[PDB]
């Protein structure tokens, strides 16, 4: 139908690099995961728009899931760039309602909980590392949780896929953290902060000081510390994919992880993270594994003894080598 063509039209307008893997999914997953994406995309577009006042935003975010069953609803007052998905929501929420009930449930659930969770972190920055996980859990982990419950609901994946929330969480925590990390300049010049204060704060006195070239030294030290943090998810990742049994689902999951891993390798001990831009076989686990193990070595081979988190980086690479 024509509202569907529009939905995949939006999927491509907005998704930098999922478009292809989503449209390649087998069966009812395709559309389940296309609409799922568009819904969360709408939700985020709201969260990120800083022209929307907090008192106006918290309600939107909270009640957003409910808008899924309000055919006529839409948001016209947005100034963010992906704002078509909101101005023309009714179309999305319509295809949502054509989704099979078993899929609407998962979607509207994760939608409902992301909402109460994004509105949570509007007031405050991300202070500690337990919080960084928490915020990454909300925006990203739940997507990881949610997708895998769609997978199993589709019957294209085992029940054991969607039962495993701890590792589905990890899949997203990892992806999300590498993005937070890479995005440091983009986030800081769009006036946002997601680097964990109790981390960055003991290299510098305010976060923006990393955009200063008189500070790059300490900047990379913070960058590596966080990378090492992010690397700690790579085992759960390897465990999660090792369980998948559908090529379409598998490529959907592997690719972005492998690509998250490349980004993290490109950024390690790398000035350009704070200067400009960072330029950078994955279709069976043991290929995927080999590929992961490879990038790990690159990290390893550039850990300077001086860097105050050398032992940790090596420490967690050594565990990834000899795990599973
Ligand atoms: O929360 P952030 O860091 O701003 C990030 C949006 C993350 C929330 C989100 C939106 C849309 C899709 C999404 O995850 C999916 C969901 C379904 C299919 C593929 C990916 C997660 S964004 O960089 O894309 O804005
Ligand atoms: Mg956001």
Q: What is the 3-state secondary structure (H, E, C) of 235-259?
A: HHHHHHHCCCCCHHHHHHHHHHHHH
- Total residue length of the chain: 324
Catalytic residue (choose from 135, 151, 268, 295): 135
Q: Which residue has the tokens 């081979």?
A: 301
Handedness of CA 307, 259, 168, 301 (dihedral sign): negative
Phi, psi at 226, each rounded to 5°: -65, -40
Residue 163 DSSP symbol = S
Q: Collapsing DSSP states into helix, strand and coil, what is residue 294?
A: helix
Residues 6+ apart with CB under 8 A from 93: 39, 67, 68, 69, 70, 71, 73
> Where along the chain do its domains lie?
1-324
Phi, psi of 199 (to 5 degrees): -95, -70
- Burial of 324 by CB count in 10 Å (0-12 exposed, 13-18 middle, 19+ buried)? exposed
Q: Is 182 annotated as a binding residue?
A: yes
DSSP structure class, residue 75: -
Least Cα distance to 200 among 228, 221, 172 occurs for: 221
Cβ neighbors of 94 (< 8 A, separation 6 or more) are 3, 71
Nearest CA-CA partner of 321 in 250, 231, 187 = 231
Residue labelled with tokens 């054991």: 160
Rounded Cα gap, residues 71 and 93, in angstroms: 7
DSSP state of 275: T
Q: What is the DSSP string of 19-41?
A: HHHHHTS-THHHHHHHHHHHHHH
- Dig out the tokens for 167 from the structure: 């590792």
Show the ligand 1 pocket: residues with CB < 6 angstroms: 18, 33, 36-37, 40-41, 44, 48, 139, 143, 179
167 is catalytic: no
User: Treating both helix axes as pointing N-terminal to C-terminal, what angle do 28-48 and 142-153 enclose, rounded to 10 degrees?
Assistant: 160
How far is C-alpha 290 from the chain's CA centre? 23
Residue 281 is labelled as binding a ligand: no
**Rounded CA Rg of the chain:** 20
- In the chain, after which residues is the C-to-N distance over 2.5 Å, breaking the chain? 280
Which ligand ends up closest to the CA of 14?
Answer: 1
Q: If you measure from the C-alpha of residue 283 to the centroid of ligand 1, how many angstroms do you get, rounded to a whole number? A: 23
269: how many CB neighbours lie within 10 A of its CB?
16
Q: Which residue has the tokens 């419950």?
A: 149
Catalytic residue among 252, 268, 274, 295: 252
CATH architecture for the domain at 1-324: Orthogonal Bundle (1.10)
Told to judge if 192 belongs to the known catalytic residues of this protein, a careful annotator would answer yes
On whether the CB atoms of residues 258 and 178 are closer than 8 A, the answer is no
Nearest CA to ligand 1 atom 11: 41
Rounded distance between C-alpha atoms, residue 23 and residue 29, angstroms: 9
Residue 233 neighbours by CB under 8 Å, 6+ apart: 170, 171, 173, 174, 177
Burial of 101 (0-12, 13-18, 19+ CB in 10 A): exposed
CA distance 5 to 301: 48
How far is it, in rounded angstroms, from Cα 248 to Cα 21? 8
Known catalytic residue at 112: no
Can you tell me which residue has the tokens 């100034």? 79
Instruction: Using the mean position of ligand 2's atoms as its centre, give its distance from the Cα of residue 47 in Å.
Output: 6
Tell me the resolution in Å: 3.2
Evaluate whether 313 touches 280 at the Cβ level (below 8 Å).
no
Closest CA to 204 of 189, 187, 222: 222
Alpha carbon of 184 to those of 188, 192, 219, 260: distances in Å?
6, 9, 11, 15
């Amino acid at each position: 139908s024509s509202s569907l063509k529009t939905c995949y039209k939006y999927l491509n307008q907005t998704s930098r690099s999922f478009a292809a893997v989503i449209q390649a999914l087998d069966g009812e997953m395709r559309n389940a995961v296309c609409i799922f994406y568009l819904v969360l995309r709408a939700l985020d577009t709201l969260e990120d728009d800083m022209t929307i006042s907090v008192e106006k935003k918290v309600p939107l975010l909270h009640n957003f899931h409910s808008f899924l069953y309000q055919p006529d609803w839409r948001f016209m007052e947005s100034k963010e760039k992906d704002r078509q998905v909101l101005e023309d929501f009714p179309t999305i929420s319509l295809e949502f309602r054509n989704l099979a009930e078993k899929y609407q449930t998962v979607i509207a659930d994760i939608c409902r909980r992301m909402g109460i969770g994004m509105a949570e972190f509007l007031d405050k920055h991300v202070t500690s590392e337990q919080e960084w996980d928490k915020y990454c859990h909300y925006v990203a982990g739940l997507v990881g949780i949610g997708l895998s419950r769609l997978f199993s609901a589709s019957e294209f994946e085992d029940p054991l896929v969607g039962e495993d929330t701890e590792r589905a969480n990890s899949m997203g925590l990892f992806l999300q953290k590498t993005n937070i990390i890479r995005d440091y300049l983009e986030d800081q010049q769009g006036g946002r902060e997601f680097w964990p204060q109790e981390v960055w704060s003991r290299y510098v006195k305010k976060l923006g000081d990393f955009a200063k070239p008189e500070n790059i030294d300490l900047a990379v030290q913070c960058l590596n510390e966080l990378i090492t943090n992010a690397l700690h998810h790579i085992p759960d990742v390897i465990t999660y994919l090792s369980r998948l049994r559908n090529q379409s689902v598998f490529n959907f999951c592997a690719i972005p992880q492998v690509m998250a891993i490349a980004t993290l390798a490109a950024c390690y001990n790398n000035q350009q993270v704070f200067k400009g831009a960072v330029k950078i076989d994955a279709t069976n686990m043991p290929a995927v594994k080999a590929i992961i193990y490879q990038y790990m070595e690159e990290i390893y081979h550039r850990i300077p003894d001086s860097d105050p988190s050398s032992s940790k980086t090596r420490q967690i690479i050594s565990t990834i080598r000899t795990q599973n």
